[PDB]
Amino acid sequence: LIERVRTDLYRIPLPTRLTDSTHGAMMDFELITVRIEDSDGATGLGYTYTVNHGGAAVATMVDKDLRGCLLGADAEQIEKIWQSMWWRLHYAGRGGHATSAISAVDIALWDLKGIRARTPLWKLFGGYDPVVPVYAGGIDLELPVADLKTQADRFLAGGFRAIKMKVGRPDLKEDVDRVSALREHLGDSFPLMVDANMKWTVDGAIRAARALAPFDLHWIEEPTIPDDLVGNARIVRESGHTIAGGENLHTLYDFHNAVRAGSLTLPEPDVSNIGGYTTFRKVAALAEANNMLLTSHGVHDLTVHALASVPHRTYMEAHLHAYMAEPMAVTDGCVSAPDRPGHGVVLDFERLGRLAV
Amino acid sequence: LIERVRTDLYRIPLPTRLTDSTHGAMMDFELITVRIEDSDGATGLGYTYTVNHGGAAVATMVDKDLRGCLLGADAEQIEKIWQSMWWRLHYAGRGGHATSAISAVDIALWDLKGIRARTPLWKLFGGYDPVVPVYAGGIDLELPVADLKTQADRFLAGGFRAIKMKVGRPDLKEDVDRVSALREHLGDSFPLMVDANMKWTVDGAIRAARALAPFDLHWIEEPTIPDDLVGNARIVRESGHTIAGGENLHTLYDFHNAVRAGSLTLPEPDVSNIGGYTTFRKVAALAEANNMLLTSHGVHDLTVHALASVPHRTYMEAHLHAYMAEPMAVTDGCVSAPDRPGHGVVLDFERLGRLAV
Ligand code: NA
Ligand code: NA
């Protein structure tokens, strides 16, 4: 039985001002942590985040709305709890911030299940291979080409053998020169992906795809808004590129629609907003059924367990480490899921207390 | 320019016996009010509500996240403000509770524009006919048959010439007997509609429709979950009934999807969660383009202006009045949009203050 649920909201400042085409101005991000304690004293950790806004709303949903579905319930019945939470915030919800709140809780419940079973989550889920390939997700749209190359050098020195850069500048010409510059810098066979963060129109995305074809990009992420199934399907049909998307999809149904409509060729769920490991694994099954690979976005320290338990995983985005006990090190383009019970992530809450909001 | 934005959250207690198939017993609805004041001292009123949970989260979004999109902005640029709010809460949002927060603000902005133009909203929007037909929407699933008819008499006494009852009981046989008793009670010329509130499975919904066909129901509302475009389109094709849906759709894109896939035959947007009047009117345009009628759900006091401005409107759902000054009276099955500047709704904030949370 669940005896305590602690929700906390922190504003973690970014070391550098990251920027993208849609919300560029990123100086800090909101972190919502959820700690769930059962009757035996074991505590599971879960967390989600937002960029610049909505953090307090998410924290409020956990604390005022979901708490009541947790206290007194058997934490071992994760699916049962997930459904109760989904329906608790269904009115006016069914997608949106409520799914991030649910993800944090779900993640904590699985952590708790892994701790009690004394086994790391990747094994608890089935177990495929703990060594997961990764890629550095740069948030560098407004970064000068010179510094873009430098950043790349740091990713390389850091162990990364795949890099993603931002695109979606006002003038396509600027993206073309930057991608061209980084391609010749990194080399011919180096995996290089781009992220437009929904910046282009359907026609603009296809136009951009033609202009970037010469550089053999590994994939183009979120060419336009995700809500447009028809238009994205058109981008898939005419761009001649792998089209990655999903960080902005928030329900299993969103992924079902996209897959069924062929509006993306590589699904990218974010365990912290798709509904937690529970929903993440279901999206993974959809991808496997459709003969698709599976990538991800965000919190790779938690995500590594999900991708280490599926056979079709590919480069995982590995863009809080300063506040972690023992974060994974990148070696030869990969990270290894830890073997401690649960997800193995431990945050320094004392140090985080300073950033509490 | 907007100089003040007051957000308040009230817990309006609800009587027992208000139940439907999936939301269960409704203990109370959380009312979020937004009052916006411009540099000339004019104030616009806007609001939205949730059932049982999520209210604090909604109020938090308006007060903490959207306030910054309002203060110092020209209230006259409703569409520009709408977009900035959509984008401010887009990460982890793009649907969900953020759309209800947005609707409250949008409704207040339109109210302010109508007050400043010294004209009622139905005229500001274009103007069709202020006399809008309505139907009584009961939340009576667990209500005994005898009480169901009793409630029906009260509705008739109230001026209603169309009634909706809840369906979705564990056993279809119960729904059939109840619908039959009400049909018998009202005469086969009386518009009787049913709301399953997403209770049935696709197969279950088709089976229910076959069983209820003898009673000539005006329409079946939300037979199953809204997320399932394919399944809903199948119900449309096989049920032989008008299929209404939309109260749980929260973006123009959701309505676009449903209409394109033919997953419903009668759209039912809710101005308080679809994005306000701004989005509601865009959904109405999609309905008109598709040769469909248009109905609605919730806050008929606000919604009356929307349906009074469109030619293809049909019965509007009607049923917070205890906190209103001049509530519209139902006469000969219709209500009349008042001709006062703006939406004309006035709430007793002194009385509501008592229920403030
Ligand atoms: Na993206
Ligand atoms: Na309904």
Swiss-Prot record, chains A, B:
The keyword Coiled coil does not apply. The active site is at 166 (proton acceptor), 297 (proton donor/acceptor). Gene3D superfamilies: Enolase-like C-terminal domain (3.20.20.120), Enolase-like, N-terminal domain (3.30.390.10). Keywords: Carbohydrate metabolism, Isomerase, Magnesium, Metal-binding. One of its GO terms (molecular function) is isomerase activity. Mg(2+) binds at residues 195, 221, 247. It comes from the Bacteria. InterPro entries: AHGA_cycloisomerase, Enolase-like_C_sf, Enolase-like_N, Enolase_C-like, Mandel_Rmase/mucon_lact_enz_CS, Mandelate_racemase_C, Mandelate_racemase_N_dom, RHMD-like. The keyword Transport does not apply. The AHG metabolic pathway may provide a useful platform for the efficient production of industrial chemicals and biofuels from red macroalgal biomass. Belongs to the mandelate racemase/muconate lactonizing enzyme family. This is 3,6-anhydro-alpha-L-galactonate cycloisomerase.
